[PDB]
Design an enzyme around this catalytic site. Structure first.
Site, PDB file in Angstrom:
ATOM      1  N   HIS A  40       0.806  -1.214   0.000  1.00  0.00           N
ATOM      2  CA  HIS A  40       0.000   0.000   0.000  1.00  0.00           C
ATOM      3  C   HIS A  40       0.843   1.271   0.000  1.00  0.00           C
ATOM      4  CE1 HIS A  40       0.629   1.393   4.142  1.00  0.00           C
ATOM      5  NE2 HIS A  40       0.595   0.128   4.517  1.00  0.00           N
ATOM      6  N   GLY A 142       4.767   6.599   9.643  1.00  0.00           N
ATOM      7  CA  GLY A 142       6.128   6.211   9.340  1.00  0.00           C
ATOM      8  C   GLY A 142       6.515   4.870   9.919  1.00  0.00           C
ATOM      9  N   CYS A 144       4.952   1.948   9.285  1.00  0.00           N
ATOM     10  CA  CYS A 144       4.609   0.819   8.434  1.00  0.00           C
ATOM     11  C   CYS A 144       5.860   0.237   7.786  1.00  0.00           C
ATOM     12  CB  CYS A 144       3.602   1.259   7.374  1.00  0.00           C
ATOM     13  SG  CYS A 144       1.904   0.978   7.892  1.00  0.00           S
TER      14      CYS A 144
END
Lengths: 300, 300
Positions: A40, A142, A144
């Site tokens: 994503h 930040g 992920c």
């Protein structure tokens, strides 16, 4: 009293990179010449509502993925999608690649998460996969792409990669093959996690750690059977205890001289009467993110 | 809910070595060509009862110190004693020596401990120096010599080295210059630590972290002064709150919109009435090993 211990993060630190596509920046895992990241990253904030990842990935080129490892800017020479994990092929083989495996853990097992923000490690902490396949951890913006792992004597067993934060505040992720833990999907939608339960075999191992460290007040002189303990455990949303769980608790039972079913009788009284204002290992609640192997590793 | 986070241990892992003298094996810190270790490695189990370290060190030679870094066996070419830390000079400069400082922390401050056994890292966890200069950590046999540290942007600030475990189960150690934290001495004797108190400024920062993460039930509509809060805090063995502590809590007060003295009024009610069977950030007890800087680093 008895502290949660995370694995040394040295072998994983040399693999964390920063992956940016447009306004979206997250973390990536730089194994030999492959940078693993949540897919994503290619989605705008609008695309996350109902993304068609196959159509979205085709719109993307190699030059749309800006990968940075500290200062060295890595040049993507290809991108492929495993189920929900993007694989960006780079020109450079990571010279700090450790010996590693990709494993898929079971609910109730623990692992260490190297929390990083924009590709730089910020901290490490010990997690446990909840029975409903969620993670109660600390994941900011930040966050992920940060991975969970265990270490077996020189080998880093990568087990988890953070993908999303559910509207209920809990976190969901995949294995390093891109398969989500639980019924969750990488789409910004209302997703319900199952009824969470307490990991019963982990509470028992934590009670053995209390006995090893001199905390013995909860031991009693009642006994129980595995059948009758469970019918009490099901009422308090505790996971059912199996004979396999009794077998894994063997080493702790031999060290303390307390049979596994004897400790379950101690746990049954704690569930029905509470702590009555006292503590176990400095805790007022029953802790369930210590596996039996975690306890024997600390109480050797 | 809000997890204790330890610093990445990569820079410290490449400095841990194994130091053995006779039957006694502990951990050492391998900076450039200096291996720092507790000086009681030269003491037999009998010598620890009343050791004369100056007479004991003279009895020792360079060849009595067997230092191992993984597999490489380091050759001691000299030994000198800073107050309670042995400095074994070796032939080899550590090629993994990071940028480091030696600092002496204040009571109430936090740091990360890389727990190792016989020179090999086993785990990492976050500590806090208790107001009575003890550490409630996990230190086994083989745990001596493990160091505590903080990291400031590339620099490892070594702050602690574990030396002894008191008969009361708590741990004591020194800075990297060999000066003990507290009134403790490296002698196997009955040593009493002072009355421990709860780090009040740390509890307030942890309450701000609860407000940031949506846990707001403990906020009330009573106020207080710094004078009148302390007279309540002293009764519950809480550390006195200073205007300096109010100043450090400034950034958290501006982020949440809750004045520092307003949060202290919330804490005063919690001390006098208890939790009434509820939890804060998943905890039933008030947590005091999160400094205000630790909270702003996680809740940025």
């Amino acid at each position: 009293g008895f502290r949660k211990m995370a694995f040394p993060s040295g072998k994983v630190e040399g693999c964390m990179v920063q992956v940016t596509c447009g306004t979206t920046t997250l973390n990536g895992l730089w194994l030999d010449d492959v940078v693993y990241c949540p897919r994503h990253v290619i989605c705008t904030s609008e695309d996350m509502l109902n993304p068609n990842y196959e159509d979205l990935l085709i719109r993307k080129s190699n030059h749309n993925f800006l990968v940075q490892a500290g200062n060295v800017q890595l040049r993507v020479i290809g991108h492929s999608m495993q189920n929900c994990v993007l694989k960006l092929k780079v020109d450079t083989a990571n010279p700090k690649t450790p010996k590693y495996k990709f494993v898929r853990i079971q609910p109730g097992q623990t692992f260490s998460v190297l929390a990083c923000y924009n590709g730089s490690p910020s901290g490490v902490y010990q997690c446990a996969m909840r029975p409903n396949f969620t993670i109660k951890g600390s994941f900011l913006n930040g966050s992920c792409g940060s991975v969970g792992f265990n270490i077996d004597y020189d080998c880093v067993s990568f087990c988890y990669m953070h993908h999303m934060e559910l509207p209920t505040g809990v976190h969901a992720g995949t294995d390093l093959e891109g398969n989500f833990y639980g019924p969750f999907v990488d789409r910004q939608t209302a997703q319900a996690a199952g009824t969470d339960t307490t990991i019963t075999v982990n509470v028992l191992a934590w009670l053995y750690a209390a006995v090893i460290n001199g905390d013995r007040w909860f031991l009693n002189r009642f006994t129980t059977t595995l059948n009758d303990f469970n019918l009490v455990a099901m009422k308090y949303n505790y996971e059912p205890l199996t004979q396999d769980h009794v077998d894994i608790l063997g080493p702790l039972s031999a060290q303390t001289g307390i049979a596994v079913l004897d400790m379950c009788a101690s746990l049954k009284e704690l569930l029905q009467n509470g702590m009555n204002g006292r503590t176990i290992l400095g805790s007022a609640l029953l802790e369930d993110e210590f596996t039996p192997f975690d306890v024997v590793r600390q109480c050797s």
